[PDB]
Amino acid sequence: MASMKKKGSVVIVGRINLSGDTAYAQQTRGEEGCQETSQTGRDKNQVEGEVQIVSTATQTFLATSINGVLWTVYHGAGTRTIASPKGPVTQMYTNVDKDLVGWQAPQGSRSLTPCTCGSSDLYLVTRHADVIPVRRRGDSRGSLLSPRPISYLKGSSGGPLLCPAGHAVGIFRAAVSTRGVAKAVDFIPVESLETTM
Numbered sequence: 001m002a003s004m005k006k007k008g009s010v011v012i013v014g015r016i017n018l019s020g021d022t023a024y025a026q027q028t029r030g031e032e033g034c035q036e037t038s039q040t041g042r043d044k045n046q047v048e049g050e051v052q053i054v055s056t057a058t059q060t061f062l063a064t065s066i067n068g069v070l071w072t073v074y075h076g077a078g079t080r081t082i083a084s085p086k087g088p089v090t091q092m093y094t095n096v097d098k099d100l101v102g103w104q105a106p107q108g109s110r111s112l113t114p115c116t117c118g119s120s121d122l123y124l125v126t127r128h129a130d131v132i133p134v135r136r137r138g139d140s141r142g143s144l145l146s147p148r149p150i151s152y153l154k155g156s157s158g159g160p161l162l163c164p165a166g167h168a169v170g171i172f173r174a175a176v177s178t179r180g181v182a183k184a185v186d187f188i189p190v191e192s193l194e195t196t197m
């Protein structure tokens with residue numbers, strides 16, 4: 001009982017810069033500092049942007065700010081706190097049935113606006129700053145216009161699907177693959193986020 005360990009916090013280790021005309025990933029913290037920060041839960045780094053790259057001790061994925069909430073997947077974050085300048089921050093949303101968790105958006109982040117366009121021409125942003133066109137096929141499904149191996153999508157759960165105007169349409173959750181080729185993606189629709197709020 002006295003030897004029971006405590007799981008570390010999720011740690012922001014970078015971001016996907018969507019500011020200019022070129023999307024590109026930036027790293028803000030290395031492996032060693034990530035491990036240190038996950039154990040203390042103290043992260044003094046400045047946060048910027050909409051899409052964060054986050055990591056635990058064993059997994060790395062994405063987290064996206066929408067309406068002042070940093071959203072990500074439960075299968076990445078579990079019930080973990082997130083590191084912040086003042087210590088670990090407890091999740092304000094947890095829904096395992098949706099594979100969804102959320103924390104208050106970090107100070108300095110920018111939030112995407114929920115989409116009300118009703119458009120089916122979407123764009124998935126990956127951890128490698130690829131902007132993949134995706135056609136919406138259902139409430140929670142979309143097909144890649146250019147299929148590719150699932151390797152290129154691994155580590156991008158928690159990333160956004162965006163409409164043509166840059167609104168948040170959903171959060172990337174799972175990949176539909178055949179023979180290792182991702183033909184479609186499963187995502188948490190922004191409306192499901194809005195009802196959880």
Ligand SMILES: COc1ccc2nc(C)c(O[C@@H]3C[C@H]4C(=O)N[C@]5(C(=O)NS(=O)(=O)C6(C)CC6)C[C@H]5/C=C\CCCCC[C@H](NC(=O)OCC5(C(F)(F)F)CC5)C(=O)N4C3)nc2c1
Pocket residue numbers: 059060061062074075076096097098099150151153154155156157172173174175176185186
């Ligand atoms: C524990 O408590 C919970 C509660 C609810 C929950 N709900 C889920 C739907 C779920 O799914 C698992 C994780 C997800 C994934 O890996 N997601 C990423 C991703 O990148 N993760 S990650 O960032 O690398 C990582 C692991 C660090 C965090 C985007 C994928 C990228 C590549 C796929 C790799 C092969 C996998 C193909 C697989 N496909 C699929 O399950 O098909 C189903 C389905 C669908 F419609 F798609 F839902 C009916 C057809 C898939 O995508 N899985 C498997 N786990 C949970 C767990």
Ligand SMILES: [Zn+2]
Pocket residue numbers: 114115116117118119163164165166167168
């Ligand atoms: Zn829109």
